[PDB]
C-alpha cells in the first residue's frame, strides 16, 4: 500500500538531512506500510509537479528551519501560498519545525527584533515542552507555531487539516510522526465517507 507524500520544505533548512532517516523520489516504511515521499525542491525553482502531483497525494510535508529569523517571512509566504493554493487546497499539511536545537542556541544571545509583536504573545495554556525547558525558548517556538497556525486558520473551511511538530535535526522518532498523521488523515477521510462526521 503506497502513500505519495509531497515534501516541499525549504533550501538549507534540514530537509535533505531529514530525508536521510531510512527533485528525487524516496521511499520508506513503518510497520510494513510503504510511504513514497516525493521531494520537489523547495517551491522556489521547481513548480513542475504542482499539476502532476496535485491530486494523488495524501499529505504535504512542509519542513522549515526555525532558528534563522532572517529567513522566516519567506517561509510564512510559502506556507500562505501552499495553504491557500488552487490544486493542492484540499490536502492536509504536516509541518516540521526543524532545528529546534539550533533555536535553543540562537535564542540565548532576539526574536522580537525581526518580528516586532513577539512580546504581545505569551506562552499559552494546553502546551507541554520537553523536560528542562527555558520559558523564553518555548515562547519563541510557540510564537512561530502560532504564526503558522494563524496562517493555517485563514480559510474557514475545515476541508483539510494541519499537523505541527517540533523535531530536532537528528531525531529518530520522525517517521512514526508521518505514520500517525497519515493514519489520522485517512481516518478523517473514512469518517467523512461513511457520513459519520
Amino acid at each position: 500500500a503506497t502513500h505519495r507524500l509531497l515534501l516541499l520544505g525549504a533550501d538549507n533548512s534540514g530537509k535533505s538531512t531529514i530525508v536521510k532517516q531510512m527533485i528525487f523520489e524516496t521511499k520508506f516504511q513503518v510497520d510494513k506500510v510503504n510511504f513514497h515521499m516525493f521531494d520537489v525542491g523547495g517551491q522556489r525553482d521547481e513548480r513542475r509537479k504542482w499539476i502532476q502531483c496535485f491530486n494523488d497525494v495524501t499529505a504535504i510535508i512542509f519542513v522549515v528551519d526555525s532558528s534563522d529569523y532572517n529567513r522566516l517571512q519567506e517561509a510564512l509566504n510559502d506556507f500562505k501560498s501552499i495553504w491557500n493554493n488552487r490544486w493542492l487546497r484540499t490536502i492536509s499539511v504536516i509541518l516540521f519545525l526543524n532545528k529546534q536545537d539550533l533555536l535553543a542556541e540562537k535564542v540565548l544571545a532576539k526574536i522580537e527584533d525581526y518580528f516586532p509583536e513577539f512580546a504581545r504573545y505569551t506562552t499559552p495554556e494546553d502546551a507541554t515542552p520537553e523536560p528542562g525547558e527555558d520559558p523564553r525558548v518555548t515562547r519563541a517556538k510557540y510564537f512561530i507555531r502560532d504564526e503558522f497556525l494563524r496562517i493555517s486558520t485563514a480559510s474557514g473551511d475545515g476541508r483539510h487539516y494541519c499537523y505541527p511538530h517540533f523535531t530536532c535535526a537528528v531525531d529518530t522518532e520522525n517517521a512514526r510522526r508521518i505514520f500517525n498523521d497519515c493514519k489520522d488523515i485517512i481516518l478523517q477521510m473514512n469518517l467523512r465517507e461513511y457520513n459519520l462526521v
Partner: protein, 270 residues
C-alpha cells in the same frame, strides 16, 4: 378490503424493486465504484432484489386471495427462496458491519487486510451458509405436511427454527452491534456536540431499522414455536412477517445515503 391491501402491497413492492434496481444500476457504469465496500453494498442490493422481485408478489397474492393458487412445488420453492434471500441480506449487513469496523480501526493497513482474495470468500461463505439454512429442511427437518395444492405452510418445525434463528439472526446481531459499537467509539474524535450527535444519528438509523424490522419476527417465531402458551394471533404474525419484507425496501433508502459517492450516483437519476 381486498383491493386496498393489494394496492398498498403493490405500492410497497414497486417502491422496493425500484429502489433496488436503482441501487444496482447506479454502480454498473462508474468505474470509480469498484471497491470492496461497494461490492458489499451491491450484494445486499442483489439479495433484496432477488427477494422483492419474486417472493413478495406471491406473498401479496397469497394475502389477497387467502389461498396459494399455484402448485405445491411452487410453495416449496417459495419458502426456500424466502429464507435464502432474508438470511442472505441479514448476513450481508453483518459483513458490511465487519468491513466498516476494519475500515475505521486500521486505516492504513486496510488494503492489506481486505483483498479480493478474501473479500470474496466471506461473500461466498455467507451465501453458502444462507443456502445451508434455506435448503436445510428440504430433506432434513421437514415435518409431514398435508398434501393440498392450496395451502402453503411455513417451515415452523422446532429444532430447525431454533438453529436458524440463532445462527441467522442472533450471531449477526451480536456482530453488528459490537462492530458498530467500535465504530461509534472511534468516530467521537478518538464543539464536540456536532461530533457526537453526527455519529449517534447515522448509526442509530442503521441499527434501528434493522432491529425494528427483524427482531419482531425473530422474537415472535422461536418464542411461539417453543413456548406454545403465548400463541400469537394471525394479525400480529402477519405484521411481524411483513416487517421483514419492509426491511428490503428500507435498505435502498439507508445504505447508499450512508455514503458520499452512492448518494451522488443515486441523485444523478433526476
Amino acid at each position: 378490503k381486498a383491493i386496498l391491501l393489494g394496492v398498498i402491497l403493490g405500492g410497497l413492492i414497486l417502491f422496493g424493486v425500484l429502489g433496488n434496481i436503482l441501487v444496482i444500476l447506479s454502480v454498473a457504469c462508474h468505474r470509480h465504484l469498484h471497491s470492496v465496500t461497494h461490492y458489499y453494498i451491491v450484494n445486499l442490493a442483489v439479495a433484496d432484489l432477488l427477494l422483492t422481485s419474486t417472493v413478495l408478489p406471491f406473498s401479496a397474492i397469497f394475502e389477497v386471495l387467502g389461498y396459494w393458487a399455484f402448485g405445491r412445488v411452487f410453495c416449496n420453492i417459495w419458502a426456500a427462496v424466502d429464507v435464502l434471500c432474508c438470511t442472505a441480506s441479514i448476513m450481508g449487513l453483518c459483513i458490511i458491519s465487519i468491513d466498516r469496523y476494519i475500515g475505521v480501526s486500521y486505516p492504513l493497513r486496510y488494503p492489506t487486510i481486505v483483498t479480493q482474495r478474501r473479500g470474496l470468500m466471506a461473500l461466498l461463505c455467507v451465501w453458502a451458509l444462507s443456502l445451508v439454512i434455506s435448503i436445510g429442511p428440504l430433506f432434513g427437518w421437514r415435518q409431514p405436511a398435508p398434501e393440498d395444492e392450496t395451502i402453503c405452510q411455513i417451515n415452523e418445525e422446532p429444532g430447525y427454527v431454533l438453529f436458524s434463528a440463532l445462527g441467522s439472526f442472533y450471531l449477526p446481531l451480536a456482530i453488528i452491534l459490537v462492530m458498530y459499537c467500535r465504530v461509534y467509539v472511534v468516530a467521537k474524535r478518538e464543539l464536540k456536540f456536532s461530533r457526537e450527535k453526527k455519529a449517534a444519528k447515522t448509526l442509530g438509523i442503521v441499527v434501528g431499522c434493522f432491529v425494528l424490522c427483524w427482531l419482531p419476527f425473530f422474537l415472535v417465531m422461536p418464542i411461539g414455536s417453543f413456548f406454545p402458551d403465548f400463541k400469537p394471533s394471525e394479525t400480529v404474525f402477519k405484521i411481524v412477517f411483513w416487517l421483514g419484507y419492509l426491511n428490503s425496501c428500507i435498505n435502498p433508502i439507508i445504505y447508499p445515503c450512508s455514503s458520499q459517492e452512492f448518494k451522488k450516483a443515486f441523485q444523478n437519476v433526476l
